[PDB]
Amino acid sequence: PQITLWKRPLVTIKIGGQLKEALLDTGADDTVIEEMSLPGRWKPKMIGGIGGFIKVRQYDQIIIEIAGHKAIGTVLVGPTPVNIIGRDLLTQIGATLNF
Amino acid sequence: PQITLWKRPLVTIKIGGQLKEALLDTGADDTVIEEMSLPGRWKPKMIGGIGGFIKVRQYDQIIIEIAGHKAIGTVLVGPTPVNIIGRDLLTQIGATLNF
Ligand SMILES: CCCC[C@H](NC(=O)[C@H](C)NC(=O)[C@H](CCC(=O)O)NC(=O)[C@H](Cc1ccccc1)NC[C@H](CC(C)C)NC(=O)[C@@H](NC(=O)[C@@H](N)CCCNC(N)=[NH2+])C(C)C)C(N)=O
């Protein structure tokens, strides 16, 4: 589909057996999801943005369905203000920027 | 053009007559440029992102060329990690997300 940018590009995603609303972010290298009790192994990581860094838990090989599109990859979990789908998963669903 | 996301969606912009590199950020409401001298009056403003809030100088109706495309609108100038083009100007040049 095509998503205009008048409003924030939000879509429904499915992760860890839960449905959430996430922002498609071309300016994000990684995918960061709100605090979740995901099962399995993880490793500590620090991700940064506009006002600084936040501590997150890195889970590899996480299956996420983005707007009906399945993808598998690394998902960072932590105190993010919003669920962010980064380029790491956007590339997997074949998302492009067009103008 | 059509921009895939295997690499950061960076483009060349022209602001204040100076060329700079900026990231097309669909996850940014506003356009934030690194500290620079810009012709025009401004008012203090504060924006937030991952990590927190930062103080920026808000310049209104700023002429800016993004990858050969022209936009005229609000440009926030402050200590951002990288120059980012938000939805405010992305919509002006007709950018959409497609998958
Ligand atoms: C005058 C303005 C008034 C309006 C003002 N608006 C805002 O504050 C709104 C909500 N902010 C935003 O939309 C900001 C961008 C700034 C802006 O647009 O102003 N967006 C953002 O900050 C979005 C995430 C987000 C979206 C919505 C809400 C909260 C957060 N992230 C943008 C950001 C771009 C990056 C190049 C700087 N990406 C990231 O932060 C991602 N990080 C990464 O991709 C890292 N790997 C990058 C390298 C890290 N290293 C380093 N920094 N040294 C992260 C999501 C994993 C307000 N105060 O409400």
Side-chain angles (χ1 to χ4, degrees), chain A residues 1-13 21-26 66-69 85 90 93-99, chain B residues 26-27 87 90-91 94-99:
Chain A
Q2 179 174 94
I3 299 174
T4 57
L5 304 174
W6 300 112
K7 292 156 53 77
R8 297 184 184 189
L10 302 166
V11 296
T12 300
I13 62 165
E21 294 290 290
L23 176 78
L24 300 186
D25 197 348
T26 58
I66 302 161
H69 287 65
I85 302 302
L90 283 174
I93 70 176
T96 56
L97 214 32
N98 304 75
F99 61 96
Chain B
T26 61
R87 294 187 295 96
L90 286 180
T91 55
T96 58
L97 273 168
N98 298 270
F99 59 85

Side-chain angles (χ1 to χ4, degrees), chain A residues 15-16 29-33 36 38-45 47 56-64 71-77 88-89 92:
Chain A
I15 180 178
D29 300 329
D30 312 288
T31 290
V32 196
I33 302 299
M36 282 186 88
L38 286 177
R41 57 111 282 172
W42 62 269
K43 56 191 297 187
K45 188 176 189 174
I47 54 168
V56 296
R57 299 193 305 283
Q58 178 187 319
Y59 292 87
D60 293 328
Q61 294 290 274
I62 299 301
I63 307 171
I64 297 191
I72 179 173
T74 297
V75 176
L76 304 173
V77 180
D88 69 321
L89 296 185
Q92 291 192 11

Side-chain angles (χ1 to χ4, degrees), chain B residues 73-92:
Chain B
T74 298
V75 170
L76 309 180
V77 178
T80 175
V82 313
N83 300 324
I84 67 97
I85 304 302
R87 294 187 295 96
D88 64 324
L89 303 184
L90 286 180
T91 55
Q92 292 205 12

Side-chain angles (χ1 to χ4, degrees), chain B:
Chain B
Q2 173 164 267
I3 302 172
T4 57
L5 304 163
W6 302 100
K7 71 165 254 67
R8 283 178 178 162
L10 294 166
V11 294
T12 179
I13 64 165
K14 197 183 304 180
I15 180 167
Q18 185 187 51
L19 301 180
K20 291 176 167 294
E21 186 175 67
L23 179 80
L24 305 181
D25 193 359
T26 61
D29 295 339
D30 315 289
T31 294
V32 195
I33 306 298
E34 65 202 346
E35 202 276 325
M36 66 175 290
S37 298
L38 192 56
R41 48 284 97 198
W42 61 268
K43 52 171 179 171
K45 241 66 185 294
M46 190 160 96
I47 61 181
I50 286 300
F53 293 74
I54 66 169
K55 289 58 184 271
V56 297
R57 310 319 172 198
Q58 187 182 311
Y59 290 85
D60 295 314
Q61 214 170 316
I62 293 291
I63 300 180
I64 175 182
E65 181 193 285
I66 305 154
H69 288 78
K70 250 216 56 183
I72 306 178
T74 298
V75 170
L76 309 180
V77 178
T80 175
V82 313
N83 300 324
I84 67 97
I85 304 302
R87 294 187 295 96
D88 64 324
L89 303 184
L90 286 180
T91 55
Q92 292 205 12
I93 67 170
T96 58
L97 273 168
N98 298 270
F99 59 85

